[PDB]
Design a protein around this ligand. Structure first.
Ligand SMILES: [Zn+2]
Length: 155
C-alpha cells in the first residue's frame, strides 16, 4: 500500500526525489507548515493511513517549534500505523528541545521509528543551503535514502 509522507519545507524538498524512488508515495508537503496544523489534516483526510500495516513519515519541526502535547496529538492520530519520525537539523534555538521530543516519542512508542537525520547529517555541510532551511539536492537524495532504509528495516 502507498506510504503517506507529511511535513514542511523539508518534505517539499524531498517529495519528487522520493516519488521517483517510490512511485506510489503520497506526498503532503507545505512550506511553513507547523506541526499543530498537521493534526487536523490527518484527522480529516488520512484516517485510512491510521491503520495497522500502514506506513507514515512525519517530517516536521524545521519550519517551527512544537510542544510535547502537540506531538503526542499528531502521533496518536496515526493510530496503529508504523510512523517514521524524522529528527531535524536547523540553525534555530529550539533545535535541541524539539529533537529531544522526537527522540523521546520514538523511545516510548513501539510504532514510532526514529529517522535520525540530525545524527546522519552531522558530517555533511554540503547537504544544507546557505539559509540553513533548504536542502541542497544531495541532501534531499540522502534524506530520501535514509527514510527508505528505515522503512525497509523498522524499529
Ligand atoms: Zn527547498
Amino acid at each position: 500500500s502507498s506510504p503517506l509522507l507529511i511535513g514542511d519545507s523539508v518534505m517539499v524538498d524531498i517529495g519528487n526525489v522520493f516519488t521517483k524512488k517510490i512511485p506510489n508515495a503520497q506526498i503532503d508537503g507545505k512550506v511553513g507548515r507547523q506541526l499543530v496544523d498537521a493534526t487536523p489534516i490527518v484527522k480529516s483526510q488520512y484516517k485510512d493511513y491510521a491503520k495497522k500495516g500502514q506506513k507514515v513519515v512525519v517530517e516536521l519541526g524545521t519550519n517551527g517549534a512544537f510542544t510535547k502535547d502537540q506531538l503526542n496529538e499528531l502521533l496518536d492520530s496515526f493510530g496503529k500505523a508504523d510512523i517514521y519520525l524524522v529528527s531535524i537539523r536547523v540553525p534555530r534555538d529550539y533545535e535541541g528541545r524539539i529533537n529531544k521530543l522526537i527522540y523521546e516519542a520514538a523511545a516510548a512508542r513501539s510504532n514510532v521509528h526514529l529517522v535520525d537525520w540530525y545524527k546522519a547529517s552531522a558530517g555533511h555541510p554540503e547537504y544544507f543551503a546557505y539559509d540553513g532551511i533548504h536542502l541542497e539536492y544531495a541532501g534531499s537524495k540522502a534524506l530520501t535514502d535514509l527514510i527508505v532504509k528505515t522503512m525497509e528495516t523498522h524499529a
